Amino acid sequence: KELKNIHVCLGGLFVPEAYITATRQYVAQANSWSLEELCLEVNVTTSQGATLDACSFGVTGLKLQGATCNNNKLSLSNAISTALPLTQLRWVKQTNTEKKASVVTLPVYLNFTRADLIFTVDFEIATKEDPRSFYERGVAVLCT
Amino acid sequence: LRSACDTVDTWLDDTAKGRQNISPDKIPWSALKTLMAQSIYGGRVDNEFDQRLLNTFLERLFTTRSFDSEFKLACKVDGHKDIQMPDGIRREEFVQWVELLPDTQTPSWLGLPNNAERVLLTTQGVDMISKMLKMQ
Secondary structure, eight states: OOOTTOOOEEETSSSSHHHHHHHHHHHHTTTTTOOOEEEEEEEEESSSSSSTTTTTTEEOOEEEEEEEEEEEEEEEEEEEEESSSSSEEEEEOOOOOOOSSSSSEEEEESTHHHHHHHEEEEEETTOOHHHHHHHTTOOOOEEE | OOHHHHHHHHHHHSOSOOOSSGGGGGSSSHHHHHHHTTTTTTTTTTOOOHHHHHHHHHHSSHHHHHHTTTEESSSSSSSSSOOEOOOOOHHHHHHHHHHOOSSSOGGGGTTGGGGGGHHHHHHHHHHHHHHHHHHH
């Protein structure tokens, strides 16, 4: 039971993709749901060591490429990598309400080569930032 | 590029049935974009995020707005200036526009951040020093 409360560096794990599936399988088991019925909500904390909800998991070492995260609202940045202190991966019942016209889906790659996709995160953009500009600038998240 | 040129000619000839001036909104934008999204430049893509990037450029560049006077090929390359769509109706006008492009290309021309070339340029500059030193 202590496996759920421990923060995990996804880069350190040998198979980071399997951890994402395991957390998805963990939440659907308690709520008697299917894995397809869970969408991944992402929350980024200012500092590590925050309140961990039952359906939430703490991940460390995620690096934001080409953007900055402030209050769960991405803005385009001219810096290379921005460290995310602690990312809470929360699994919730899917409500299939489409996007929100200010949401970008960011690939999460294992390392800088971007040769291996781990999973996908959804963030809400801020100001008038065009989500298409995020796509063109190659905004992504690195596990290590 | 050749396949895309054949596709452009095939579908433009299909719509403009031997006519002199086809309306821009009657150009088969859906046919051109989809065929390039899926088959031409699209068949090589094995990544959904690279596919989305390919779709983003095709959706921005192949519309009726491309025939407007103030169409914008790229926006804010150097923060203030940006690249305007030439108002040409003949091939020679477009070739003149290409020849008048400045020699100040930055990755912002491509939609990339301008820092994308910083490491690549720095390595080449050191590479030039190493090559010059070796030939001494």
